[PDB]
Automatic annotation (TrEMBL), chain D:
Part of cytochrome c oxidase, its function is unknown. This is Cytochrome c oxidase polypeptide 4. InterPro entries: Cyt_c_oxidase_su4_actinobac. The gene is ctaF. It catalyses: 4 Fe(II)-[cytochrome c] + O2 + 8 H(+)(in) = 4 Fe(III)-[cytochrome c] + 2 H2O + 4 H(+)(out). Pfam families: Cyt_c_ox_IV (PF12270). It is an enzyme of class 7 (translocase). Belongs to the cytochrome c oxidase bacterial subunit CtaF family.
UniProtKB/TrEMBL annotation, chain G:
This is Cytochrome bc1 complex cytochrome b subunit. It comes from Mycolicibacterium smegmatis (strain ATCC 700084 / mc(2)155) (Mycobacterium smegmatis). Keywords: Cell membrane, Electron transport, Heme, Iron, Membrane, Metal-binding, Oxidoreductase, Respiratory chain, Translocase, Transmembrane, Transmembrane helix, Transport. The cytochrome bc1 complex is composed of a cytochrome b (QcrB), the Rieske iron-sulfur protein (QcrA) and a diheme cytochrome c (QcrC) subunit. GO terms for biological process: respiratory electron transport chain.
UniProtKB/TrEMBL annotation, chain H:
The chain crosses the membrane at residues 6-27. This is Uncharacterized protein. Residues 70-79 have a biased composition (Gly residues). Residues 55-79 are annotated as: Disordered. Residues 55-67 have a biased composition (Basic and acidic residues). Keywords: Membrane, Transmembrane, Transmembrane helix. It comes from Mycolicibacterium smegmatis (strain ATCC 700084 / mc(2)155) (Mycobacterium smegmatis).
UniProtKB/TrEMBL annotation, chain I:
Its main location: membrane. This is Probable cytochrome c oxidase subunit 3. It is an enzyme of class 7 (translocase). Keywords: Cell membrane, Membrane, Oxidoreductase, Translocase, Transmembrane, Transmembrane helix. It comes from Mycolicibacterium smegmatis (strain ATCC 700084 / mc(2)155). One of its GO terms (molecular function) is oxidoreductase activity.
Amino acid sequence: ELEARRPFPERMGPKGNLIYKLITTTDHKLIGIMYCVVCFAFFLVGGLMAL
Amino acid sequence: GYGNSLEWATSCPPPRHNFTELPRIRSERPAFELHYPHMVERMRAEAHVG
Amino acid sequence: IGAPDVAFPRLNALSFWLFLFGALIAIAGFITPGGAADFGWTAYSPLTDA
Amino acid sequence: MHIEARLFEILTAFFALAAVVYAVLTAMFATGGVEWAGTTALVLTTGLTLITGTFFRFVARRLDTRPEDYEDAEISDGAGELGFFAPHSWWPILISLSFSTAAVGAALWLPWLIAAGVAFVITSVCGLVFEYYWGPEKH
Amino acid sequence: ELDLPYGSALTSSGRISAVTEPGELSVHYPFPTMDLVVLDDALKYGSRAAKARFAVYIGPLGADTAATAREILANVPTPENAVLLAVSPDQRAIEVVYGADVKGRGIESAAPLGVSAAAASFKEGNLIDGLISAVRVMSAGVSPA
Amino acid sequence: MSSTQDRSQLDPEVERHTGVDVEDVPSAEWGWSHMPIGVMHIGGLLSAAFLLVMMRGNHVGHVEDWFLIGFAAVIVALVGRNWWLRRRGWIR
Amino acid sequence: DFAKLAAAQGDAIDSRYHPSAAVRRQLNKVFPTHWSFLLGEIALYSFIILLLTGVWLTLFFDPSMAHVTYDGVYQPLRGVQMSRAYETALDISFEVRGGLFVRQVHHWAALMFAASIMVHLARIFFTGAFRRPREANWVIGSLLLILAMFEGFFGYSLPDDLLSGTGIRAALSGITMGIPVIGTWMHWALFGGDFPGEILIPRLYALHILLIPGIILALIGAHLALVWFQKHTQFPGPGRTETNVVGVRVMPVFAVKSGAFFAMITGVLGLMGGLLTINPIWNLGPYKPSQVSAGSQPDFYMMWTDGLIRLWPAWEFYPFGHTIPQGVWVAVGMGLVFALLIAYPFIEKKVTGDDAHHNLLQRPRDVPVRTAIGSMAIALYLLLTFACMNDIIALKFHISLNATTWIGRIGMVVLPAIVYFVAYRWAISLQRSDREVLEHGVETGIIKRLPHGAYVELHQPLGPVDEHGHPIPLEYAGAPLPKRMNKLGSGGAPGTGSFLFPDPAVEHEALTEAAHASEHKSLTALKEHQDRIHG
Amino acid sequence: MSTALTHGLIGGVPLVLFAVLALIFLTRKGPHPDTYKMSDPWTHAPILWAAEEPREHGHGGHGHDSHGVVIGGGASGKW
Amino acid sequence: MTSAVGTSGTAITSRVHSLNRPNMVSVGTIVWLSSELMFFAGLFAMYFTARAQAGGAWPPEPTELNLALAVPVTLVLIASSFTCQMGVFAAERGDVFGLRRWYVITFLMGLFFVLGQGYEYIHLVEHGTTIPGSAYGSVFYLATGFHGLHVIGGLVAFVLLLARTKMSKFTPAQATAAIVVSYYWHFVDIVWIALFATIYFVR
Ligand SMILES: CC(C)=CCC/C(C)=C/CC/C(C)=C/CC/C(C)=C/CC/C(C)=C/CC/C(C)=C/CC/C(C)=C/CC/C(C)=C/CC/C(C)=C/CC1=C(C)C(=O)c2ccccc2C1=O
Ligand SMILES: CC(C)=CCC/C(C)=C\CC/C(C)=C/CC/C(C)=C/CC/C(C)=C/CC/C(C)=C/CC/C(C)=C/CC/C(C)=C/CC/C(C)=C\CC1=C(C)C(=O)c2ccccc2C1=O
Ligand SMILES: CCCCCCCCCCCCCCCC(=O)O[C@H](COC(=O)CCCCCCC[C@@H](C)CCCCCCCCC)COP(=O)(O)O[C@H]1[C@H](O)[C@H](O)[C@H](O)[C@@H](O)[C@@H]1O
Ligand SMILES: CCCCCCCC/C=C\CCCCCCCC(=O)OC[C@H](COP(=O)(O)OCCN)OC(=O)CCCCCCCCCCCCCCC
Ligand code: HEM
């Protein structure tokens, strides 16, 4: 009558599971996350210019 | 809570292919109807009052 | 919208990489000795010609 | 696809009106007659939306009311075989890299690099298109 | 049958689509995130050597503590090779249970050691630290099948 | 369906019982999969030291030295972060 | 009567000698049919082309520094003092029919020889074709690569030229003469005196037509004999074990395809010799110490040494009344590079501990640390190679020359680390992809489940399927997995008529049924052999 | 105007504002429940935690069946 | 692997059942072609601005259009569009080889159009007019040569689709691919009709 869950969710994940996804990513969700991270990196790069 | 737009009808990390289910889509708030069935009548009653 | 994926999911992957690499080669103007583009974002005609 | 077609029909109506009024008010009441840039751009964005809306209307008349278009459509109604959505593929990044090579070759006027980039673009587009059609190796 | 007090609905399939009010959380565990992470690290890879599913049950295990421990172990996904450490502070009780596949791998010898570590830490006043210490000791004791 | 499963018995010979595990590197038994972390830490530290040492040279320039400083600093920061996290058990 | 003549000649051969058993062994020898195993054959064929063109070139080349005024046919260099080597190279280019083509295809064959040696080295290193057995084969192959590098170095330096003579002055003279204890002595022994000594080109000609090519031929013979009698290793597969070679026999298939590959490789080399201009020595005036160009690069195989020279940060030491120039740094760097390359298999075995007799290759993904190290080394080599080209890179791609130099300097410690980390994680993620394919089947198009709106990719299991939908996961066997139903029996039977018109339905059905039967027969034969071996 | 003053202002006002806002916000009780004290009664619902450590046949639920609890020992303690 | 978990005879199939639903590939192609229309709109704007700013004699004295070579090429492009539509009909049927024949002759006629455009380019360059030579020359070359690049892209698409049909069995997926390639070719010939009417007749 009770569920066996983890004390905390997996923090990061096993070595070598994302690098190949990014190259071969075809899930819109992962691509959207790649957009957000990469786009935000350009925000910092472009924002540094304003400073 | 009280979310809508059908993206909240799935696990917070969405399953690959976004869904294991789909609720009855009736209005612009499928997830609100899914989570609060009692409001379904209310959302229609007060809709036009504005 | 309740869909599992975008219409052309290899295409949207190409769109991201075109964005990333297209963006980088624009930033690449800085590493050149002259620098990036002098003309403003608008890049008006006479100031932009060779 | 009635609403999908009607959206583009409305856009076509508005853009045609804008193109016509711009052309008239620029042929007369402008310093040098018709602008010939805004006029052409407005005419051909009217053409853009007109092509899209005409195709959507053709499809709407060709197809019976889909569950998606049908209000009061149950999930089971649309439940069935969705088509082939491409799984993981590393050809998009190669296409982007090839087009970036061609683009830098165009920027830095290097005809050799432009040719190499175009060859790589052809190769990578061929790879992407043939990805799910390259039959098993026949030895 | 009744779903959560508010906002949780049974869906077309078995899964229950639940909601939480915007300001509040879902896990509601009464432990620091870092200590929960440390315990998860233990259970996850400090037990990989044991190759036996290590489980922790902080809930109250009343009546016959041994038997309630037996059935909460049964509730573990793979009780065949599993080691469940149950702590009830409402009863100040520890109970460790093991699967049949977890036999003769040093588990039985490690049982008193793990329970002693847990008890020492608890009397010091650290439930989570005691759980981690017990998990570490038991994992060190247990040998892979 | 037109594919046959593969049976492989490669000769094995460290026994992999210490170091990396299949859960972390699925093909741990199939080849060299573990580089000691000390090796990578010392390599990063020596790379940073080499970058800093290249500042001493016959160049009147200064942006070169600043680039060396920045790259050495980020290398040392990464090495320190990794070492600290592993010391504490991959925390924070 | 060709059949009668062949039978009579066979009887004569088997009477004079008795080669029946040995010849049958050679013909029946089985060679794996993997494409990556033709990479060494590329180098072998390029070497053969090099020999054939080099004989022709030696028939016309005159090695000497004896000064001469051209008085030839090439007008832009007339009355200019030049060495006999340069004069006869110009004569080959202009006043000998097909001489320009022969020398161009020779140089292109040299470039392909180096490139294919490099690619073959990559293949063997990444697939682990050197451990326990074949480690000596790797060692002699490393010696062969070094010899090829220096052979090309002496080759493109053979026609005394402005570019190549400048390269000689840099490397052979400066590096040799900077070496602390014996540097000047080695320089004088090699050059018969000061740098422009009147024996350098004759000595290099000897070294390049007879001495070094003789050693290369001997080492290639040893290499091929070792590969022949230490049966070629193979990738893990259905019927492939550590105690068998699955492939095709020498006579019917392997021999014909190897000969055809040789034909195609020499065709590529000839096409490049025709269409692509290589080393226009006529453009590159005769060597004069006072003259120089801006390019000043060696061939791509020595480009990494030149890039090391460029990038290394001008560190010189001055002991008591002595100098230790920066040339010694690059010399020691090259020594370390070659020592590590030659001694890697022994280094790898000392580190890991594996001395087991390995006959089954391992996919580069299956060995993350070694593929990571190889990627790191290739990244460093590419960094050095482009550092040597920083001059033209800066010129064409508008980047300041100092910026390119310092990009190389910083990268040669940053880029190797980045590539190591990326390659390690990439290999592990390829392993993870293989495991996910094993445990879930191949991916396909999405389907919406009937009762509810669940979306499922509708995978296809690669093994026995459990009573319910999910399959029994398979165990990784060191062999590639099909990640596209494309490559399985799915949508692969187009009308077998022609490109423009169909064929009769009876013929098409016969052909496709026969092909399907052949595929079934091959797969069943592999399956039964695998079962017999492992049971 | 007062080059040093302007530099100090642009470098400090952001820092002062950041410090003030951090004192205001980062020093507020978070939504994470406070650590459970041993003295206090255990009010939270039962918490069973599992490692997810080993491989479990196939991910598919069906076919697992219920072989049995198959107990393999015991232990006890009272702090 | 009993038979297959995905009961499909093609590893790749139509992205949605097109009988009851819109063809996603066709929809995307139509939208992208509508965008390429705006690209050519920018080119047309350039040309029309140059025309407006010309001082009466829009084609300068050195330049002289060759209708003798411009009418055959546009007629050949119209014929190519007709043959492409015939190939589309073949693809709608299961006629793999009929589609291949129609698309091969379409590719040949498109290549003939490209070669004719190149010949007219060579003749024009010889007779003075050049991209740097004059504003008319430059706008004309930009417009018509970007269209020629689009035609070359269509030729590449044709050969690539034909290779795909060779390598895999004909299915609704390949039929739709042929349909969208034909949509691109029809768009190319339509923009060519516009460019011809503008450059040559309207001037
Ligand atoms: C030692 C060292 C590496 C110093 C750093 C200098 C350097 C190489 C910088 C990069 C060069 C580039 C890519 C310049 C373009 C501007 C730039 C930096 C843009 C941003 C780069 C970036 C991350 C872009 C994102 C997408 C991406 C990966 C784009 C890459 C684009 C390119 C140029 C790809 C090809 C790489 C390439 C060929 C670089 C030049 C290297 C060489 C040695 C070319 C040799 C070569 C030359 C030089 C000829 O002139 C020539 C003339 C006629 C026929 C043949 C050739 C020929 O083969
Ligand atoms: C203006 C001017 C002078 C122009 C000319 C340029 C010039 C100077 C020279 C080039 C001119 C020439 C002569 C070019 C052609 C070179 C040549 C001999 C090409 C042969 C290819 C050809 C014509 C094939 C025809 C198609 C056909 C029927 C092929 C099957 C029958 C044939 C020819 C089989 C040949 C088999 C073959 C390549 C034997 C090579 C012998 C050698 C050296 C090694 C054999 C060998 C091989 C090949 C391995 O791969 C191997 C792998 C692992 C372990 C051991 C071995 C091993 O021992
Ligand atoms: C199996 C072998 C296959 C090989 C096929 C061979 C291809 C043949 C190419 C075309 C014929 C060559 C004619 C020889 C006459 C000739 O040399 O060709 C020049 C052109 O040259 C250029 O620009 C480049 C033009 C672009 C097209 C050719 C590019 C081919 C490359 C891509 C093939 C090699 C592979 C390289 C891959 C690299 C990519 C890496 C990713 C043309 O004159 P021009 O243009 O005026 O030369 C200027 C001087 O005058 C002036 O001083 C000087 O300043 C310059 O401006 C010079 O250009
Ligand atoms: C472009 C890149 C540069 C070119 C790269 C090519 C050069 C070769 C590459 C890498 C060499 C370094 C490898 C890493 C060495 C590992 C060190 C260690 O800590 O030892 C652990 C091992 C595992 O033992 P285990 O029972 O599995 O226990 C698991 C414990 N966690 O022990 C041992 O057997 C071995 C101990 C001694 C090893 C000595 C190896 C080097 C010999 C001198 C050759 C020069 C090296 C040049 C380095 C660049
Ligand atoms: C073994 C590998 C060999 C390599 C990598 C190699 C490489 C080269 C290269 C790159 C050149 C420059 C050609 C030019 O600049 O036009 C050259 C020249 C030459 N090679 Fe070799 N070669 C090899 C073997 C041989 C052999 C076996 C011979 C004689 C049979 C030979 C004879 C010559 C001659 C005479 C020249 C001078 C041609 C000239 O000055 O244009 N080479 N070599």
